[PDB]
Amino acid sequence: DNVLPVDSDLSPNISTNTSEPNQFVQPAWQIVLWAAAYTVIVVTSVVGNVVVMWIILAHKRMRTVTNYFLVNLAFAEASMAAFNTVVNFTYAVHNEWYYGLFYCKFHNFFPIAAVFASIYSMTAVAFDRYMAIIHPLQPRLSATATKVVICVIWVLALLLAFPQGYYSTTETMPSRVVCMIEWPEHPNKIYEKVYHICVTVLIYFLPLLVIGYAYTVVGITLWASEIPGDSSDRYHEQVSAKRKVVKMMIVVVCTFAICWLPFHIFFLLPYINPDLYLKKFIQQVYLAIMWLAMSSTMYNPIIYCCLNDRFRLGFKHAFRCCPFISAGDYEGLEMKSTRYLQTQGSVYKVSRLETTISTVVGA
């Protein structure tokens, strides 16, 4: 059933993804279809993620530790839109890996790093949520640490992403020109088999479990129920506000799992039964999921807008060059003081709370 590519070479038709078009694998139009999907994605992913990164940096008020983690996520998405999607697009219209083996490596490595980093960052977010809920004590926490933490996630991400570059597994996806870890063969010199189990479980699965677990602990504490006003089942507006953040974080995770999980499952199943067909082992299946994972890059900016008024209002401030932020503003801390932005609403040295300075702000 299999050749180096997913299709059988009953005919001599099969040709290397590096050398020629893969038109035999799927209809040519399907190639343009995937190319089309990528092109549109590039626009959305770039604009949305840039907006997120831009807005939080631009608006002084949105400086939360969580915001730091989100920039990290946004950054990971940006790399996808700039780095990975572009190559994936070129290939698609070419119908194969014009770039050749070196590039397959470059292209797989960066995209792999992006996926690993995302799930790992989501875990940090989960843990931080747990910490915020149980121990509101603000001082046990530092912005500086967050940067350190973010860097750490990247380091671990490299731990999986980089070793394939080290003599380890390698390869292109079903129709593909997307490159990923070598699930198909057990290229012995390469020691593929070991790498495969290790990577999925350690990088994707374990972090998924932790996020799930941390999620459960949060269940006892702040839950979905949150009354819009501070009053009612909320003990302080800040407490009531936080519940909003947690819910978005939950949705962010959910969307993440839905997008990626199918790929990871297919990752493993072919590992167990390579050279065979799953329900059907084909170009189409592997392809659909990996490209689907790419869509994730776009979803987070949408969730933010829908999910939180603060970003929504603050973003709008950014969109219209001037303030022009009608629509009711944040009606809370657009900024703590009032409106928030680089300028405009976010007044220098935003106000402080408590005789002492409760939040590390107004420093």
Binding site: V3, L4, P5, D9, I14, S15, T16, N17, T18, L101
Partner: peptide
């Protein structure tokens, strides 16, 4: 073709 180009010994 993907077979004759088994020179992937580089990766």
């Amino acid at each position: 073709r993907p077979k004759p180009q088994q020179f992937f010994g580089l990766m």
